[PDB]
């Protein structure tokens, strides 16, 4: 079949101190509107560790969007590369 593909974001977990969650952080290099130089930004997205993925602190994690599981939670974890910490 043909299925529309979701958007993906790769990030590093910053903290995890709740039930079934992992507040991940994603960086980007958007250009400046005027001086035209890359600027590093930081935004802390949230996901849920439903199971089989664990993804404890310091784990480089891939993230795929989803239908909103709750307020401020719209992302879920996926394949994990460079398992550490």
């Amino acid at each position: 079949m043909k299925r529309n593909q979701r958007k993906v974001l790769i990030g590093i977990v910053k903290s995890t101190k709740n039930a079934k969650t992992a507040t991940v952080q994603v960086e980007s290099r958007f250009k400046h509107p005027l001086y035209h130089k890359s600027v590093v930004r930081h935004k802390k997205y949230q996901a849920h560790n439903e199971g089989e993925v664990l993804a404890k602190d310091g784990d480089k994690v891939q993230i795929v969007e989803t239908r909103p599981l709750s307020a401020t939670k719209r992302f879920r974890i996926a394949k994990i590369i460079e398992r550490a910490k």
Partner: protein, 135 residues
């Protein structure tokens, strides 16, 4: 300076101030608020007429008037003419301007549009002073 420095603190442009601030204040008179709406020329009412002395070089007696506009600002306005009918209590119509001799004066009175009479005995540049065509 430096690209990083300007990225952190961008260039702030110097502000611009008007030359006739009192003509751009509107009082609602129901809610009693003053909003900044630009207006070319505004109606006021005079309170005190008289003469002032020009600053350093000039020497004369120039006709001024302390006029309070339709808003709540009282301004010193120069009457541009030879002879006037101002009687310390009248309605005038101020426009922008700036006489160099008198410090503090930054408005002029349009002649011959409202209660203030026009300037007769003038055939040159009369359209500025409000004088009927001799015909």
């Amino acid at each position: 300076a430096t690209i990083a420095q300007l990225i952190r603190k961008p260039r702030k442009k110097k502000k611009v101030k008007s030359k006739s601030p009192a003509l751009h204040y509107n009082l609602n008179l129901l809610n009693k608020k003053v909003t900044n709406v630009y207006s070319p020329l505004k109606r006021g009412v005079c309170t005190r007429v008289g003469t002032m002395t020009p600053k350093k070089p000039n020497s004369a007696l120039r006709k001024y008037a302390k006029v309070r506009l339709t808003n709540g600002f009282e301004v010193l306005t120069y009457i541009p003419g030879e002879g006037h009918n101002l009687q310390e209590h009248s309605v005038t119509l101020l426009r922008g301007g700036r006489v160099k001799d008198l410090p503090g004066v930054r408005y002029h009175i349009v002649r011959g549009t409202l209660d203030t009479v026009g300037v007769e005995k003038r055939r040159q540049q009369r359209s500025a002073y409000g004088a009927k065509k001799p015909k």
